[PDB]
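Morning!

As promised:
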Amino acid sequence: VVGGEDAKPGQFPWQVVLNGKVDAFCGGSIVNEKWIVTAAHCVETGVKITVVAGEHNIEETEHTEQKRNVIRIIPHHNFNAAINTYNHDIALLELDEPLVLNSYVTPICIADKEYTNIFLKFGSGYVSGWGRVFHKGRSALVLQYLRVPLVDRATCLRSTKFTITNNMFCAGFHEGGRDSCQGDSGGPHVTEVEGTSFLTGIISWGEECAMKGKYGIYTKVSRYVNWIKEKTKLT
Amino acid sequence: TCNIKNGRCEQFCKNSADNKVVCSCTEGYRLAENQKSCEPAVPFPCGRVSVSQTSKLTR
Ligand SMILES: [Ca+2]
C-alpha cells in the first residue's frame, strides 16, 4: 500500500497474510474459521501455502498470530478461462485446522449480491496489506491501510488500454500518490457500515502503482458472494 | 419504505406490506427489540473491531 498509514493492532482483524515460496506475497480475508478469500492470481494451482491471521508486524512476535496450512484451494471456475485478463480474480482457501476467533482474528462480513453492491456505491472503502510501499520499492513490515474513493466506470474505462470487465471496479485518487500495490493482492477492499465492515472487493491488479491518471483495479465481490457462500459452508 | 435512509435499518431492509419495512442483519447479529438495530449474537461477530483501541479513556 503506497501512501497509506500503519494500522493499529487489531484494526483489521479479518486481514491475513499468505506465505509460501515467497514470504508475505499476498493478503486475504477471513470468511469463517476454516476459509480465507483471496485473489486467484496469488494461488497458482500447485504450490504450498501458509496463512497467518492475527498478524501485525511481519518481523516481530505479537503473540496474536495464528498460523494455518492451506489444504484446499478453489480458484473461481472462470479465472484464466481467457489469458492475461485478470477477470474473476478471486479464490478460496480451506485451512487445515480452524482459526480461533478473538479480537485479532475475526471474519469480515459478506452481504448478499444486492447489498454488497449498495455498500460499494457508498463510494469509500479501505484497502490494507503488507505489499510494496513504493512502486518497485520495499514491502511493509507493519500492516498498512488506505481509504480509497470509488471511481466512476467511464473514467475507469478511460484510464487504461486494458479491459475493465463488469466483474471489476476502479478505486483511487485522480492525483495519484495513494494506491494498493504488488504484494497487496488478495487483500480486502472493505466498506464500513455503521461500525460493521463488509467485503466489497479484492485487491487485484493495476499499472504500476499510485501513478496519476491510473487507478487500482479490484475484483467486484458482489458478483461472487453467492459462490463464496456455496463453497465455504461448515458442517 | 426502504427507499429512504435504508428504512431506518442498521443493516438490511426489505419492503413488506402497506408501505412498511422489515429489517434484518448479517450472520452473527440479531435484530434488536426496536426492530431496526443490529446487536452481536456471538462473542466475535464479523466485521467489528473489538480491541476497541488505545489505553487512556473512561471506557
Ligand atoms: Ca508478528
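Residues A 55-58, 60-62, 65 surround calcium ion (CB under 6 Å).

Hope this helps with the figure draft.
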